[PDB]
């Protein structure tokens, strides 16, 4: 019945210090090691360090030396991980891992859900909606939005079939663009309305653009 | 530092097939190798430890073996729950290093893409930036080459690509390459095209517009 | 160094003959001890008997500079580093009335630099006493009474004894609080609850394979000042017998283990062991082609004495080893548990001398 509950997702400027917590229940906290593994978007896993709460002192990776600080409060039964001098390269999902074996720090059986740490640099800008006018295809281009995510729809839930919404792509400019497309009958073209509903909650932006052949 | 090399990067297989994925260490790591499974937007799950030992609650189809400094994870009969990314990890010396990863995809029939070219909106065209979108609809496999040609001159370093996850219904891929230029370079040039090279196409399909 | 390698090589070959006889039993042997005593016996021998010993050992003691290097090796192996950790003795007992060869005693003292002990074997109980007293007074009473001395007769004219005791102080002692009782898997499959000590440290660790293709691991355990060290070798899989490792043992392989080692972080669970072994060297030496030594008339000891037909009436080695927490935090990804029969080697690293070696089948 081992559970690992982590703190909420955080968005920070490239200053800066981010501290993620990990509540462990239920088992002996003092004896077993709690490690921190990170995962960049569309990339592999990376170990940062680990701690045996009774030891007091944590093990670290020479790559992150002078930045990371791994602590564990035995009374609170929560392990912490703070990362100083943050930058765009630190943008990753941070996982809390626990060892099945006593006194060792090697492989992990128990894993936490993950805490997303976004590193920007960006204001909190709304999305610029542009249409892609024309079996036939027509789209909806979402541009320069921050932060992620953005939920997009067509015909207000009316169309699920043949619709592809691509993942966000991050631009050189520190901001995102998305695209959405739909495969519809050409016969239906110019005779049926199509509208793309873009919802961006963090900045509270709701745009409903109509796509027509022009 | 022990470098973990995983072969292949991407693997395509059918349900009930035997799947073998390779891991390689830059130096001897004894039997101290762990195997993890990861699904999109989910935490990694340990399957194998000590190269061949099976973790608690993990099914029989999962196997592990050691061949010197190379380790292989075997799935005897591939199941619908098995389509995920797999990572190998070493626990011989610090730092604890993970592999590049091997995604296991559904084997489908070779499906040629439907190529569509979208010019920029006049709105946008006006706001100083121009975005030209090339759409590749429902194809297999994921391997596709998209080339941008502005007045028959090949482009480089000014376009961005985006791929969708393998579909739940037809298990096909969708790709979108977006060429981004200033409104002022858009307007000096005429012909805009995107050449698509794919297995399904016997000859590279090029979709062009004049503006 | 070259003589230290030759001496250890011969000694590991004698151990293999002792180990193959026991097979399922605990054995503690001194490869240097048997080489040191037979290097001394080479001086007493002549003809067919001398060439049998010289061929099996791989060296002649009268060759230059075999003996000065052998003396320099003892001075080296001995003092001032060993805090009464190791206690050794070599003794050649000969008949008191027996007329020795003119110029044997000054030649034996010139090369060792000790003497052949003279005792009267007609006084059987006093003769047995002096042999056991020599072992007790020189090994600090740590070695129990000899059982082989029961072969001492009136017709006895030549007795060979070599006794060694070792209980070394670890460089990093095992904590007493960390010593727990754990199951030990015997060769016959059965399990026993034995006290096992534990420590998390950076150990010199390596992996090798047997001819049949099986993995075996070697862990290096240093004693204070890095002078002495203990190697623990055992196959990875429990289905693999320790004999598969013992059958391939050599002084060159032990050096390869040391050369291929890498310092790695590990949690080591090793059992506490105290072994005492008295070996009749007759059969292990006869199996190595040194048959003449123990034959009534065939034995050629003409270099020592030619007054009476001489031959070895008794050849023994009694070794006692003690392995505990100390003679008198740390992070690790994997643990090593020595819960199956293992091989141990006590090595003197600056010269590569294999002082002790054995098999712990049941601690």
DSSP structure string for B7-70: E-SEEEE-TT--EEEEEEESS--TT-EEEEEE-TTS--EEEEETTTEEPTT--TTEEEEEETTE
Listed in sequence order, the residues at least 6 apart from B156 whose beta carbon sits closer than 8 Å to its beta carbon are: none
- Domain of A142, CATH number, reads 2.60.40.10
Q: Which two tokens stand for residue B178?
A: 């977006």
Q: Method used for this model?
A: X-ray
Same-domain pairing of A127 and A102: no
Listing DSSP states for C278-298 in one string gives: EEE-HHHHHTTT--GGGSTTT
What is the b/e burial string over C155-165, where b = at least 16 CB atoms within 10 angstroms of the residue's CB?
ebbbbbbbbbb
Q: Report residue C221: phi and psi, to 5°.
A: -115, 100
CB neighbour burial string for C143-153, b if at least 16 within 10 angstroms, e if fewer: beebebbebbe
Asked if the bond preceding A121 is cis, omega within 30° of 0, the reply is yes
Single out the residue of C117, C34, C108 nearest to residue C71, CA to CA: C108
Q: Which helix (H) or strand (E) holds B175?
A: strand B173-182
Superfamily of structural domain B1-107: Immunoglobulins (2.60.40.10)
Q: Domain B108-211 falls in which CATH fold?
A: Immunoglobulin-like (2.60.40)
Q: Whose CA is closest to C161, among C311, C31, C30, C37?
A: C37
**A8 plus A106 within the same structural domain:** yes
Query: Cα separation of B32 and B130, whole Å?
Result: 53
Name the domain boundary from A121, A138, A162: A121
Q: What are the residues facing B92 on neighbouring strands?
A: none
Q: How far apart are the first and last CA of chain B?
A: 54
Q: What is the DSSP string of B124-167?
A: HHHTTEEEEEEEEEEEBSS--EEEEEETTEEP-SSEEEEEPPPP
CA distance linking residue B81 with residue B72, whole number of Å: 20
DSSP one-letter string for A71-126: EEETTTTEEEEEE-S--GGG-EEEEEEEESSSS--S-EEEE---EEEEE-----PP
Other beta carbons within 10 Å of A33: 25
Residue with tokens 């393998």: B166
Tokens 């590990």 found at: C266
Q: How far apart are CA A75 and CA A99, in angstroms?
A: 19
Q: Is C236 on the interface with B (CB under 8 A)?
A: yes
Task: Specify the number of domains making up chain A.
Answer: 2
Distance from CA of B206 to the nearest CA of A (A): 16
d(CA C10, CA C266): 34
Q: Which among B28, B31, B96 has the least Cβ separation from residue C333? A: B96
Cα torsion at A149, B45, C200, A69 (round to 10°)?
10
Three-class DSSP category at C259: helix
Find all residues with CB under 8 Å of C307, minimum gap 6, and list them.
Answer: C98, C99
**Do both A14 and A110 map to the same domain?**
yes
Flag whether residue B159 sits within 8 Å of chain A, measured between CB atoms. no
Same domain, A92 and A146: no
CB atoms closer than 10 angstroms to residue C56? 15
Specify which residues C358 forms β-bridges with: C28, C344
Nearest Cα residue to C71 out of C30, C104, C40: C40
Its domain, for residue A127, covers 122-214
Residues of A with Cβ-Cβ distance to C332 under 8 angstroms: 103-106
Rounded alpha-carbon distances, angstroms, from residue C351 to B80, C171, C259: 62, 19, 14
SS3 C211: coil
Query: Does one domain contain both A92 and A138?
Result: no
Q: Which residues pair with A94 in a beta bridge?
A: A38, A115
- Residue A188, both tokens: 């239906």
| Total residues found in chain A within this entry | 214
Mapped onto helix, strand or coil, the DSSP state of residue A16 is coil
Q: Is C335 on the interface with B (CB under 8 A)?
A: no
Q: Which of A68, A57, A60 is nearest to A17 (CA)?
A: A68
Per the CB < 8 A criterion, the answer to whether A198 and A176 are in contact is no
Q: How far apart are the first and last CA of chain A?
A: 60
Nearest CA in chain C to B49: C334
Distance (Å) from the C-alpha of residue C183 to the closest C-alpha of chain B? 21
Domain ranges of chain B: 1-107, 108-211
Q: How far apart, in whole angstroms, are the C-alpha atoms of residue C150 and residue C143?
A: 17
Please choose, from the candidates A175, A166, A178, the residue with its C-alpha nearest in 3D space to the C-alpha of residue A147: A175
Q: Which residue of C has its CA nearest to B91?
A: C333
- Ranges of beta strands (E only) in chain C are 27-29, 86-95, 117-119, 158-166, 180-185, 191-209, 215-222, 228-235, 262-271, 273-280, 314-323, 334-337, 342-348, 353-360
- Whether residue C265 lies within 8 A of chain B, CB to CB, comes out as yes
Q: Using CA atoms, how far apart are residues A68 and A154, in angstroms rounded to an integer?
A: 45
Q: Give yes or no: residues A33 and A129 share one domain.
A: no
With an 8 Å Cβ cutoff, is B91 touching chain C? yes
Q: Which chain C residues contact residue B92 at CB under 8 A?
A: 264, 333-334
Instruction: Give yes or no: residues A109 and A152 share one domain.
Output: no
The CB-based long-range contact list for B43-52 (8 Å cut-off, 24+ gap) reads: B43/A95, B43/A111, B43/A112, B43/A113, B43/A114, B44/A37, B44/A45, B44/A95, B44/A111, B44/B87, B45/A111, B46/A107, B46/A108, B46/A109, B47/B73, B48/B73, B49/A107
| First vs last C-alpha separation in chain C | 33
A150 and A181 share one domain: yes
How far is the C-alpha of A2 from the C-alpha of B57, rounded, in Å?
Answer: 14
Give this entry's resolution in angstroms: 2.9
Is the same domain home to A135 and A202?
Answer: yes
How far apart CA C86 and CA C230 sit, in angstroms, is 14
**H or E element, residue A139:** strand A136-145
Give the Å distances, CA to CA, from A47 to A35, A40, B55, B90, C194: 8, 12, 21, 11, 38
Query: Are both A45 and A107 inside the same structural domain?
Result: yes
DSSP type of residue C242: T
**B108-211 matches B1-107 in CATH topology:** yes
What chain A residue is nearest to B55 in terms of C-alpha separation?
A: A109
**C243-280 burial: b if 16+ Cβ within 10 Å, else e:** bebbeebebeebeebbeebeebbbbbbbbebebebbbe
Q: Are residues A75 and A95 in the same domain?
A: yes
Segments in C43-91 forming alpha helices (H): 47-57, 66-77
User: Are A97 and A141 part of one and the same domain?
Assistant: no
- Element at A152 (helix H, strand E): strand A151-154
User: Tokens representing A42?
Assistant: 């569309």
Among A104, A121, A138, the domain-final residue is: A121
HSE, CB side, 13 Å, CA atoms: give it for residue C336: 28
Question: Which chains neighbour A (Cβ–Cβ under 8 Å, 3 or more pairs)?
Answer: B, C
Q: Where are the beta strands (DSSP E) in C63-222?
A: 86-95, 117-119, 158-166, 180-185, 191-209, 215-222
Which two structure tokens, joined as six digits, stand for C110? 């010139």
3-state secondary structure of C154: coil
Going along chain C from its start, the domains and CATH numbers come out as: 28-165+276-320+329-329 (3.30.497.10), 166-275+321-328 (2.30.39.10)
């Amino acid at each position: 019945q081992v559970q690992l509950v982590q703190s909420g997702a955080e968005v920070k400027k490239p200053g800066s210090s981010v501290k993620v917590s990990c509540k462990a229940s239920g088992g002996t906290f003092s004896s077993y090691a709690i490690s921190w593994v990170r995962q960049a978007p569309g990339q592999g896993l990376e170990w940062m360090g680990g701690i045996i709460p009774t030891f007091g002192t944590a093990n670290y990776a020479q790559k992150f030396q002078g930045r990371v600080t791994i602590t564990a409060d035995e009374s609170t039964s929560t392990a912490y991980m703070e990362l100083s001098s943050l930058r765009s390269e630190d943008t990753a999902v941070y996982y809390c891992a626990r060892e099945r074996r006593q006194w060792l720090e090697g492989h992990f059986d128990y894993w936490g859900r993950g805490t997303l740490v976004t590193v920007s640099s960006a204001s909190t800008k709304g999305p610029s909606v542009f249409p892609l006018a024309p079996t036939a295809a027509l789209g909806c281009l979402v541009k320069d939005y921050f932060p992620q995510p953005v939920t997009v729809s067509w015909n207000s839930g009316a169309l699920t079939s043949g619709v592809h919404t691509f993942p966000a792509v991050l631009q050189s400019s520190g901001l995102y663009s998305l695209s959405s497309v739909v495969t519809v009958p050409s016969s239906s073209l110019g005779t049926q309305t199509y509208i793309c509903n873009v919802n961006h909650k963090p900045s509270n932006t709701k745009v409903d653009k109509k796509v027509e052949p022009k | 530092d022990i470098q973990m090399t995983q072969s292949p990067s991407t693997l395509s297989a059918s349900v009930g097939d035997r799947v073998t994925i390779t891991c390689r260490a830059s130096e001897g790591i004894y039997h101290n190798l762990a195997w993890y499974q990861q699904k999109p937007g989910k935490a990694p799950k340990l399957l194998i430890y000590k190269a061949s030992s099976l973790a608690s609650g993990v099914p029989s189809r999962f196997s592990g073996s050691r061949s010197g400094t190379e380790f292989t994870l075997t799935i005897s009969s591939l199941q619908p729950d098995d389509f995920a990314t797999y990572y190998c990890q070493q626990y011989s010396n610090y730092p604890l290093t993970f592999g590049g990863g091997t995604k296991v995809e559904i084997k489908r029939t070779v499906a040629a893409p439907s190529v569509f070219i979208f010019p920029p909106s006049d709105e946008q065209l006006k706001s100083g930036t121009a975005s030209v979108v090339c759409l590749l609809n429902n194809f297999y496999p994921r391997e596709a080459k998209v080339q941008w040609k502005v007045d028959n001159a090949l482009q480089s370093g000014n376009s961005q690509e985006s791929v969708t996850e393998q579909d739940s219904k037809d298990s096909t891929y969708s790709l979108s390459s977006t060429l981004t230029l200033s409104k002022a370079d858009y307007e000096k040039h005429k012909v805009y095209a995107c050449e698509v090279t794919h297995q399904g196409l016997s000859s590279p399909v090029t979709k062009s517009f004049n503006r | 160094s070259y003589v230290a390698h030759l001496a250890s090589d011969f000694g590991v070959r004698v151990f293999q003959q002792v180990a193959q006889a026991s097979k399922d039993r605990n054995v503690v042997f001194s490869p240097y001890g048997v080489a040191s005593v037979l290097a001394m016996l080479q001086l007493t021998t002549g003809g067919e008997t001398q060439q049998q010993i010289q061929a099996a050992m791989g060296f002649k003691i009268d060759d230059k500079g075999m003996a000065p290097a052998l003396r320099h090796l003892y001075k080296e192996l001995m003092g001032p580093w060993n805090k009464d950790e190791i206690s050794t003795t070599d003794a050649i007992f000969v008949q008191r009335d027996l007329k020795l060869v003119q110029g044997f005693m000054p030649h034996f003292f010139r090369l060792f630099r000790s003497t052949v002990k003279q005792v009267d074997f007609s006084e059987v109980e006093r003769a047995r006493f002096i042999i056991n007293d020599w072992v007790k007074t020189h090994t600090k009473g740590m070695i129990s009474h000899l059982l082989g001395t029961g072969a001492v007769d009136q017709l006895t004219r030549l007795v060979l004894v070599n006794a060694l005791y070792f209980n070394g102080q670890w460089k990093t002692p095992f904590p007493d609080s960390s010593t727990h009782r754990r199951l030990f898997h015997k060769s016959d499959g059965s399990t026993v609850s034995v006290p096992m000590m534990a420590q998390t440290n950076k150990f010199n660790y390596t992996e090798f394979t047997t001819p049949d293709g099986h993995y075996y691991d070697i862990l290096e355990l240093p004693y204070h000042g890095d002078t002495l060290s203990m190697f623990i070798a055992a196959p990875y899989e429990k289905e693999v017998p320790l004999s598969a490792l013992t059958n391939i043992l050599s002084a060159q392989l032990i050096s390869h283990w040391k050369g291929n080692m890498t310092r790695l972080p590990r949690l080591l669970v090793l059992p506490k062991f105290s072994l005492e072994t008295e070996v009749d060297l007759r059969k292990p030496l006869e199996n190595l082609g040194m048959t003449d030594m123990f034959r009534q008339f065939q034995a050629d000891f003409t270099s020592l004495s030619d007054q009476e037909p001489l031959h070895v009436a008794l050849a023994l080695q009694k070794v006692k080893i003690e392995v505990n927490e100390s003679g008198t935090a740390r992070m690790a990804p994997e643990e090593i548990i020595i819960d199956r029969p293992f091989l141990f080697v006590v090595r003197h690293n600056p010269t590569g001398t294999v002082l002790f070696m054995g098999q712990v089948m049941e601690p």
